[PDB]
Design a protein around this ligand. Structure first.
Ligand code: NAP
Length: 316
């Protein structure tokens, strides 16, 4: 298992990164510092997470300490839904760059295909509780992302939470200048994503798997929800390999040629989660884990189900 995957912009991306959604601002600086110290070279960020300044403190301190060089890091962020307008994209990117203490991003993603009305609120509501859309179509947002490449602010651009028809719309865009490098989607044994993964891979788009552990700290968790980390069937595979359940859940997407971004703010778990390059799941293990699919989503964007670009009505 090599540590990096080649993107269609010619750059290499580390297949293991550190997630930062829900990482508290008072803990994420140390989390990122520890991650870099124990070998992580890829950090997954977003403006909507409200902690990029604190992530950036860690990155800058490790660059200053010469623990790593900037060229060895792969920093990802995402354009939030209230910035899909062409006149807002550059400023949104530049705010993320300023907060992260960077001159460029390695990868910048459209966070969701759904654009929302600009303003201070990340989920602007009408008086009846619906999210207020933007009129800007995703192809125009894509053109604005392409401009960021041509201005030197980002090395690669991509998408997140796009269904296969939405990926295809980007690939079929009149005058397309840069293909998406990555589609970042939820993926784990309860949401295995065979169809969308094969489509993206067949087009040279690398897939990143988010919520690989089933996001046990998601805000809307209910006790009756299925739990990957507690599933006896997955625990049994881990025991057979003398690894933790989390380590199996991280290795699983790696063996599907995916990038994976487990989140932790716990130093011991950050280190544990990186120790996944020294064992192999068998083909039988892989097929067994795939068999657990139940189309269960951590992130359903449940307030956006009437948005014209809501991604999860389509089968895939
Ligand atoms: N593009 C998108 O729309 C999108 C959506 C969701 C997620 N993401 C990205 O993907 C990342 C990962 O997804 P996620 O944050 O939803 O969840 P996740 O990585 O599946 O799970 C994180 C949870 O697992 C715990 N954990 C981590 N390592 C563990 C271990 N070895 N043993 C036991 N528990 C462990 C963490 O606890 P502690 O932190 O307390 O250790 C935290 O509660 C996000 O942080 C974000 O960067 C992107």
């Amino acid at each position: 298992m090599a540590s990096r995957i080649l993107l269609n912009n010619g750059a290499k991306m580390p297949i293991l990164g550190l997630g930062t959604w829900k990482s508290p601002p008072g803990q994420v600086t140390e989390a990122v510092k520890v991650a870099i110290d124990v070998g992580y070279r890829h950090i997954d960020c977003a403006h909507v997470y409200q902690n990029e300044n604190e992530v950036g403190v860690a990155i800058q301190e490790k660059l200053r300490e010469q623990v790593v060089k900037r060229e060895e890091l792969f920093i990802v962020s995402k354009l939030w839904c209230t910035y899909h307008e062409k006149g807002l994209v550059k400023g949104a990117c530049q705010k993320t760059l300023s907060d992260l203490k960077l001159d460029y991003l390695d990868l910048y993603l459209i966070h969701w295909p759904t654009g929302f009305k600009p303003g201070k609120e990340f989920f602007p509501l009408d008086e009846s509780g619906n999210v207020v859309p933007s009129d800007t179509n995703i192809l125009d947002t894509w053109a604005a992302m392409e401009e960021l490449v041509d201005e030197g602010l980002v090395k690669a651009i991509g998408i997140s939470n796009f269904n296969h028809l939405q990926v295809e719309m980007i690939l079929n865009k009149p005058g397309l200048k840069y293909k998406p490098a990555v589609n970042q989607i939820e993926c784990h044994p309860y949401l295995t994503q065979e169809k969308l993964i094969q489509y993206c891979q067949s087009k040279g788009i690398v897939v990143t798997a988010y919520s690989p552990l089933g996001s046990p700290d998601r805000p809307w968790a209910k006790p009756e929800d299925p739990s990957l980390l507690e599933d006896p069937r997955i625990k049994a595979i881990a025991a057979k390999h003398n690894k933790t359940t989390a380590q199996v859940l991280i290795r699983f997407p790696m063996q599907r040629n995916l990038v994976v971004i487990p989140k932790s703010v716990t130093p011991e778990r950050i280190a544990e989660n990186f120790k996944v390059f020294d064992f192999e799941l068998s083909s039988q293990d892989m097929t067994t884990l795939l068999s657990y699919n139940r189309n269960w989503r951590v992130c359903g964007a449940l307030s956006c189900t009437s948005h014209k670009d809501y991604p999860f009505h389509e089968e895939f």
